[PDB]
Design a binder for this molecule. Structure first.
Ligand code: HEM
Length: 397
């Protein structure tokens, strides 16, 4: 629902160049501050000043559109003080100390097992590594088998598609259907790990929720749901895009293999160069003017904060994957303001620890030379921008 905005098609466009997405967004930002994306179904805010303002004025740009779907009752759908309260609690699970504990207890072991398992006939690091690792990690946080989560794949994406394409009745309906079909699993996990007294990081989370007097069936389900949507599906694509960036720049890959301390930068520059999400959705709560542009109350819009990822003035030669950029580029993929991804520290860590294992174990790692991946937003019916595959050779050396 928009007005005088140029039509555009920025998201669902395949390209063999992983930079195409970023460039397109940037190119559109230079033509106009707001466009209407016909495939994505809403006005897209592209100018940094509009976006940074919008992240901070939550009463004008709210997350109330999430109150009408499966995320109702979760953190993202909360507003004002209710959100602040609950965010305080979600924050406790992602503190540096907690995140390191997860690294030693789960993510390092699991990443090593996942990687050794590849030493397989025809390796695709998307399905065999980037999807595998986060799924197994969530498996272990729940005390639940990873193969049972793997069968939720199509449901997890159906759930997510209805959170983005909410202008689409069928996507919304399938999102609800899929949640209902996954409620059993989610409730089971909650019951086992809220049990008498047992031991999963999930158990610790549920005991914390109770200690803070926020223990409800909805809250417990929503946390579990978060861990699935973010810590499994969304994290996968961040790992995939980072890998691709390294494979596509073998000098940089070599440097990183020789000095793993370069990994955090490799990941942050990854998020700039080849971002896995677009930003965020927001509901305009009052008629608002943004320079010459007008938006009506009731319009859902997208803040495409990644349109700055290719601003030459901030990141010269934006097409170039340069892990030496300093300061490191600001991570627009996690959103902004009060709703900024609370799981980021876990996600960044899974990527670091997973990649380090991979590069340690296969010095010979390289892309298969003329099977170029294809990139688009909507890859595999997800809500990520990502490759369709990442075929690799693990030797010579
Ligand atoms: C790794 C586990 C993850 C978990 C458990 C998780 C969880 C969450 C939660 C609960 C929120 C809502 C926070 C709030 O409203 O205050 C959130 C927001 C968000 N997360 Fe994640 N997340 C994860 C990973 C990721 C990854 C890898 C990405 C993107 C690459 C991502 C992108 C986002 C974005 C863009 C938002 C903002 C939505 C908004 O501001 O409206 N997250 N995450």
């Amino acid at each position: 629902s928009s007005m005088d905005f140029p039509l555009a098609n920025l998201f669902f466009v395949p390209s063999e160049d992983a930079t195409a997405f970023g460039r397109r967004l940037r190119a559109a930002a230079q033509q106009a501050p707001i466009v209407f994306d016909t495939a994505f179904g809403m006005p897209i805010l592209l100018r940094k000043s509009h976006i940074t303002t919008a992240y901070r004025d939550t009463a004008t740009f709210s997350t109330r559109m999430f109150q009408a779907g499966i995320l109702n009752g979760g953190l993202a759908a909360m507003q004002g003080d209710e959100h602040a309260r609950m965010r305080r609690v979600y924050n406790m699970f992602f503190l540096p100390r907690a995140v390191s504990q997860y690294e030693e207890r789960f993510v390092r072991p699991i990443s090593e097992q996942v990687v050794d398992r590849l030493a397989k006939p025809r390796v695709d690091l998307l399905e065999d590594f980037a999807m595998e690792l986060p799924r197994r990690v969530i498996g272990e946080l729940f005390g639940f088998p990873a193969e049972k989560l793997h069968e939720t794949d199509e449901r997890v994406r159906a759930m997510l598609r209805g959170l983005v394409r909410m202008h689409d009745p069928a996507a919304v309906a399938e999102s609800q259907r899929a949640y209902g079909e996954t409620l059993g699993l989610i409730t089971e996990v909650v019951e086992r790990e809220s049990r008498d007294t047992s031991d999963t990081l999930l158990g610790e989370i549920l005991r914390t929720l109770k200690a803070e007097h926020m223990d409800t069936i909805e809250a417990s389900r929503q946390i579990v749901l978060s861990l699935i949507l973010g810590g499994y599906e969304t994290t996968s694509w961040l790992v995939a895009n980072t890998i691709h960036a390294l494979l596509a720049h073998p000098d940089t890959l070599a440097r990183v293999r020789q000095d793993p301390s370069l990994l955090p930068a490799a990941i942050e520059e990854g998020m700039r160069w080849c971002p896995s999400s677009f930003g965020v959705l927001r509901m305009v709560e009052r008629d608002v003017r943004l320079d010459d542009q007008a938006l009506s109350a009731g319009t859902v819009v997208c803040l495409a904060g990644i349109a700055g990822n290719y601003d030459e003035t901030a990141y010269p030669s934006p097409e170039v994957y340069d892990i030496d950029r300093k300061p490191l580029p600001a991570a627009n993929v996690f959103g902004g303001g009060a709703h900024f991804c609370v799981g980021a520290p876990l996600a960044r860590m899974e990527a670091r620890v997973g990649l380090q294992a991979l590069l340690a174990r296969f010095p010979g790692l390289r892309a298969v030379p003329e099977e170029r991946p294809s990139f688009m937003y909507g890859a595999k019916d997800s809500v990520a921008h990502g490759p369709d595959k990442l075929p690799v050779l693990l030797h010579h050396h």
